Design a protein around this ligand. Structure first.
Ligand SMILES: Nc1ncnc2c1ncn2[C@@H]1O[C@H](COP(=O)(O)OP(=O)(O)OP(=O)(O)O)[C@@H](O)[C@H]1O
Ligand SMILES: Nc1ncnc2c1ncn2[C@@H]1O[C@H](COP(=O)(O)OP(=O)(O)OP(=O)(O)O)[C@@H](O)[C@H]1O
Ligand SMILES: Nc1ncnc2c1ncn2[C@@H]1O[C@H](COP(=O)(O)OP(=O)(O)OP(=O)(O)O)[C@@H](O)[C@H]1O
Ligand SMILES: Nc1ncnc2c1ncn2[C@@H]1O[C@H](COP(=O)(O)OP(=O)(O)O)[C@@H](O)[C@H]1O
Lengths: 531, 326, 44, 109
């Protein structure tokens, strides 16, 4: 009839997209399951158009290829877009109104007993662009749309045709075809989720595992975890790239001659390090984030005193509060302290430890070189994107620099400041949560601008002053031997007991002293000079 | 003269038809050829490039020993390097591994006997040194390229079929002017024992009549599809090289000409590189100076996977180039 | 401030003119081959 | 066949031996002419054997630039019509562009 009696969808390759399949099945072929008599008794018409769209390389063409064989359908007619056009006058419109002849004949012959004929238009946006483009030339690029529209709208009661159109850019499609009675249902295919990623990995490595060609060491769960934003095509590329490494241990290309170990050919086996190297080779094209924050804390923590622990605990308390309550849909925090004490690292650490689904960081590095309007648009888009997921953390770094503050004017950009002021107070749409954490070093200047009323709480980050903390950082950095580490501190105790430096400068001085002369004469000299 | 290496371990023989008009589609057993070779010529001394005339079942063939490996009695493993120099000579034995390759004419239809030997209509042949390409510098890019692209076509078909993967079908080379990104394409096209390359200059596709620009970009793949339908997975590599790629295949969506040809060409190429029908025996090479204008959909894996940057040389590269030129 | 290109369609009449008269010349050639064969027999 | 070695003169030279910079008719520029006639028209006079034993190819480009009204077109004309070669294929400035979609590139081809 319309679906084969022997089919369960477990065999078909497409994996990771199950909800979309159910939606398509429910809204497309459901009406053609019962005997016809019910439908007219219920006064419901059949659907005629289906549209699929998504980013490049998500699996739509796979669905189109396998649907015909999977669901006992008449061999679908497949035509590439730009193959319609032709040279002689009137040829193209004929070519379009030459595909529907079989359906018309069968309809006229057998009334409602006619089977279902399905034709799918690959690269739909190729020919059916906007029909008001203009150009003052050959009009064959417009009568094509008119012919298709005439045969699809003024069908003369053809109710046994379903057209499927796959595209990558919906915006380019002529608006005239997006209306009831013509391509009604539109299904979006987006990037897979982690479980879909595992399904895809299983499908790709099925045959490899079956023939004992994969070493037992490999663990698919770890790989699924590592591939943060990989689509299906990139996963397949990763698989074969990893296989190339295993291939390239027996056959040495270039070096020497062709030396094929006929014995190791039977022992060919992939392993984990090959997969890690393949991860090294292939890169995603989506990215967004989850790397900038990691590199922002590259130097790591040191827990040189209790203040770090207390601050981290307070951050944990706030993340818990935003995670639990449903009435607190917005929390903002300020982190202020002397310059160079280290602020961005702490915020990044807390954000990483939180483990929320959505995390991002806004810093002047990204915005550099843009025009002011571009900066405004970028900030607005970033906020709007952040307003999407159920839980969200947003980090703002060096607010004063984002506003171009210089104390000679004083000159600064008012538009950006006003936008940030209004944005920091906007609660997200219903049933969403946000946690904003902003850092600064010019507390007084913020006080003068009178934007201190949009922050719920403030956290200070005093720099270190006791020589004990210096000793801790020294021992953690492994600057010198134990005797030297003791001697330097005893000397500095009497050289300059009072101490106010920071953290960054300490590591810089440590390295410079290591390079030239690890003895006192350099490290202690610089340390005393700075303070 | 030899001292210890007195026997022949592995011998490679190129087989050709003495007369082009005597080509026969008969299936030749390599085991029978080796048996005849041992039966007729025993305890003889042979050297690389030495020629012979063989009469097998009334058919006359020209045999050229392309390479020879000399081994001493008692060597369990053939750890000796295969030598292409005429200096090496050996004595034929009833156990020498005889590998037959097609002659330069490529008319003899050999059987694969039951030996799972490397012998195939090879793309890369044996003994291929990077020192004969003639390109100085770029000694890491060549590795990467050959590992990712040609590493899977010189392997027994059964194993690659078991692994259930497919050969890559893209390659892109980009960099500043004058770094040597067209020499590589020429040498790859000429030195790989494949069909003649199908060179296309940058804007050589466009044409006046409506619907003829798109056809010119789908008349390049017709022969590949023609061969892939008949001989399955035994077809020879087909290679086509696009020069100055970024001239036509710009990001579709702008307003360039006012007619709308570039978008159609881009769509046709998109639909033909991956499409709904499998080809799996084609390769296309690209070159450009600006890699930020190419349409995004082209750069997805499955189309132009491997992308390489060719940059200015270092001091050792400069020395190598100076040595090559003079 | 703007410019425009231009494309061209062939004449419908032409159609498949490659074989509009190819079929006809092929048919006449077949007639001429028949003529040649009959003349060969007559000369014999 | 193969090129052995024995060779002194060439069969159809380009510049011939009866040439001197006082015959062109361009006055003033004198060092420029030496440079031009050494870099470009010096590898087409030696016997082909030696030039083939050096493994070098000839230069295939020349550019002249300067203020307005100095002698560029005069040099081009004299070089074009005082040698032993095929007739020049002169092209004016925007003489390549055409109206149809793919006729300009064909004109350059
Ligand atoms: N608690 C800490 N323990 C260990 N290392 C730290 C700590 N805090 C900061 N650092 C390190 O100190 C360095 C400076 O930190 P960071 O770049 O955040 O400085 P900052 O004071 O925010 O900068 P700026 O002065 O430019 O506003 C980084 O390498 C960071 O990893
Ligand atoms: N290793 C090398 N790298 C670069 N050039 C080389 C090298 N060895 C020799 N050459 C010489 O330098 C020339 C390099 O130019 P080539 O033909 O590769 O164009 P290209 O650098 O890709 O230029 P474009 O991007 O302008 O097309 C070659 O023609 C060759 O004569
Ligand atoms: N060095 C020269 N010796 C003799 N006559 C000269 C010289 N330079 C210029 N002239 C005279 O100038 C006239 C115009 O010069 P020419 O054709 O070289 O113009 P041009 O430099 O190409 O100018 P433009 O920039 O306007 O194209 C020539 O016909 C010639 O009579
Ligand atoms: N579930 C899946 N999702 C995405 N790609 C898949 C999936 N299963 C297999 N693939 C592989 O990814 C590719 C599908 O990409 P495709 O849909 O053809 O790209 P496009 O979206 O541009 O048409 C094929 O190589 C296919 O083998």
């Amino acid at each position: 009839a319309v679906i084969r009696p022997d089919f369960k969808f477990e065999d078909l390759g497409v994996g990771g997209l199950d909800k979309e399949f159910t939606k398509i099945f429910r809204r497309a072929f459901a009406s053609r399951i019962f005997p016809p008599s019910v439908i007219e008794k219920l006064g419901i018409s059949h659907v005629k158009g289906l549209l699929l769209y998504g980013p490049p390389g998500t699996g739509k063409t796979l669905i189109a290829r396998k649907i015909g064989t999977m669901l006992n359908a008449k061999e679908p007619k497949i035509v590439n877009g730009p193959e319609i056009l032709s040279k002689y006058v009137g040829s193209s419109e004929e070519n379009i109104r030459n595909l529907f002849k079989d359906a018309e004949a069968e309809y006229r012959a057998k009334g409602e007993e006619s089977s279902l004929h399905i034709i799918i238009f690959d690269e739909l946006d190729s020919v059916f662009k906007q029909r008001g483009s203009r150009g003052d030339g050959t009009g064959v690029g417009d009568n094509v749309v008119n012919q298709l529209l005439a045969k699809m709208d003024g069908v003369d009661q053809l109710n046994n045709i379903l057209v499927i159109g796959m595209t990558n850019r919906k915006d380019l499609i002529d608006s005239a075809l997006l209306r009831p009675g013509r391509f009604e249902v539109q299904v979006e295919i987006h990037l897979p989720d982690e479980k879909g990623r595992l399904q895809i990995f299983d499908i790709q490595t099925k045959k490899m595992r079956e023939n004992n060609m994969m070493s037992d060491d490999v663990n698919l769960a770890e790989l699924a975890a590592l591939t943060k934003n990989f689509s299906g095509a990139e996963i397949e590329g990763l698989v074969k790239s990893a296989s190339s490494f295993a291939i390239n241990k027996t056959v040495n290309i270039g070096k020497g001659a062709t030396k094929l170990n006929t014995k190791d050919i039977a022992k060919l086996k992939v392993t984990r390090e090959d997969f890690l190297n393949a991860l090294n080779d292939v890169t995603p094209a989506f990215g967004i984030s989850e790397e900038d924050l990691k590199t922002c804390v590259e130097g790591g923590m040191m827990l040189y005193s209790e203040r770090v622990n207390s601050i981290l605990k307070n951050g944990a308390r706030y993340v818990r509060q935003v995670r639990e309550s449903d009435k607190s849909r917005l929390v903002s925090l300020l982190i202020h302290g002397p310059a160079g004490s280290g602020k961005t690292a702490l915020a990044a650490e807390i954000a990483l430890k939180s483990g929320f689904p959505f995390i991002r960081l806004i810093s002047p590095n990204e915005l550099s070189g843009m025009s002011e309007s571009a900066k405004i648009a970028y900030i607005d888009n970033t906020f709007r994107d952040a307003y999407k997921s159920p839980l969200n953390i947003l980090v703002i770094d060096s607010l004063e620099t984002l506003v171009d503050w210089v104390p000679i004017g004083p000159r600064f950009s008012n538009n950006i400041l006003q936008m940030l002021k209004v944005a920091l107070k906007r609660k997200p749409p219903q049933d969403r949560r946000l946690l904003i954490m902003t850092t600064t070093s010019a507390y007084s200047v913020l006080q003068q601008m009178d934007i201190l009323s949009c922050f719920d709480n403030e956290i200070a980050v005093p720099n270190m002053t006791n020589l004990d903390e210096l000793n801790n950082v020294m021992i953690e950095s492994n600057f010198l031997d134990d005797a030297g580490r003791v001697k330097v501190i005893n000397e500095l105790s009497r050289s300059c007991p009072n101490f106010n430096v920071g953290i960054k400068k300490t590591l810089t001085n440590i390295e410079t002293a290591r390079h030239d002369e690890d003895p006192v004469n350099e490290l202690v000299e610089l340390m005393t000079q700075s303070a | 003269y030899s001292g210890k290496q007195s026997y022949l371990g592995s011998i490679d023989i190129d087989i050709s038809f003495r007369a082009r008009g005597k080509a026969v589609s008969t299936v030749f057993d390599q085991d029978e050829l080796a048996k005849q070779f041992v039966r007729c010529y025993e305890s003889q001394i042979f050297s690389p490039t030495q020629y012979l005339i063989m009469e097998f079942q009334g058919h006359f063939f020209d045999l050229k020993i392309r390479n020879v490996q000399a081994i001493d009695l008692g060597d369990i493993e053939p750890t000796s390097a295969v030598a292409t120099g005429i200096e090496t000579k050996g004595i034929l034995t009833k156990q020498t591994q005889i590998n037959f390759f097609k002659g330069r004419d490529g008319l003899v239809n050999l059987k694969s006997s039951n030996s799972l030997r490397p012998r195939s209509n090879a793309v890369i042949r044996p003994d291929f040194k990077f020192e004969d390409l003639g390109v100085g510098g770029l000694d890491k890019e060549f590795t990467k390229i050959f590992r990712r692209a040609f590493a899977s076509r010189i392997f027994p078909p059964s194993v690659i079929e078991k692994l259930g993967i497919s050969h890559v079908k893209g390659l892109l080379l980009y960099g500043p002017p004058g770094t040597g990104k067209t020499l590589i394409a020429r040498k790859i096209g000429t030195m790989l024992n494949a069909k003649e390359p199908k060179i296309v200059n940058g804007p050589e596709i466009l044409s006046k009549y409506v619907g003829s620009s798109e056809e010119n970009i789908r008349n390049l793949f017709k022969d590949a599809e023609a061969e892939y339908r008949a001989k399955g997975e035994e077809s020879s590599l087909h290679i086509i090289i696009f020069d100055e790629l970024d001239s036509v295949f710009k990001q579709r969506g702008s307003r360039g000409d006012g007619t709308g040809v570039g978008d159609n060409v881009v769509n046709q190429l998109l639909a033909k590189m991956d499409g709904v029908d499998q080809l799996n025996n084609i390769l296309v090479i690209g070159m450009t100076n600006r890699k930020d204008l190419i349409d995004s959909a082209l750069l997805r894996p499955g189309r132009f996977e491997v992308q390489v940057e060719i940059h200015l040389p270092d001091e050792k590269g400069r020395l190598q180039i100076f040595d090559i030129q003079t | 401030g703007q410019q425009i290109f231009s494309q061209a369609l062939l004449n419908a009449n032409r159609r498949g003119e490659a074989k509009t008269a190819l079929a006809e010349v092929q048919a006449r050639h077949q007639e001429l081959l028949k003529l040649e064969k009959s003349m060969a027999e007559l000369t014999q």
